[PDB]
C-alpha atoms as one frame of an Amber mdcrd trajectory, in Angstrom:
protein
  97.146  21.017  29.169  98.019  24.676  28.778  94.511  25.634  27.811  93.280
  24.828  31.266  95.462  27.307  32.808  94.469  30.986  32.436  97.928  32.346
  32.696  99.443  29.651  30.473  96.657  30.218  27.925  97.336  33.904  27.912
 101.213  33.925  27.900 101.634  31.134  25.578  99.807  31.903  22.236 101.585
  28.942  20.481 100.746  26.629  23.183  97.118  27.571  23.394
């Protein structure tokens, strides 16, 4: 889950 990761969430607007 990309939403759980702060960096993933921030850099992946399509993912989360």
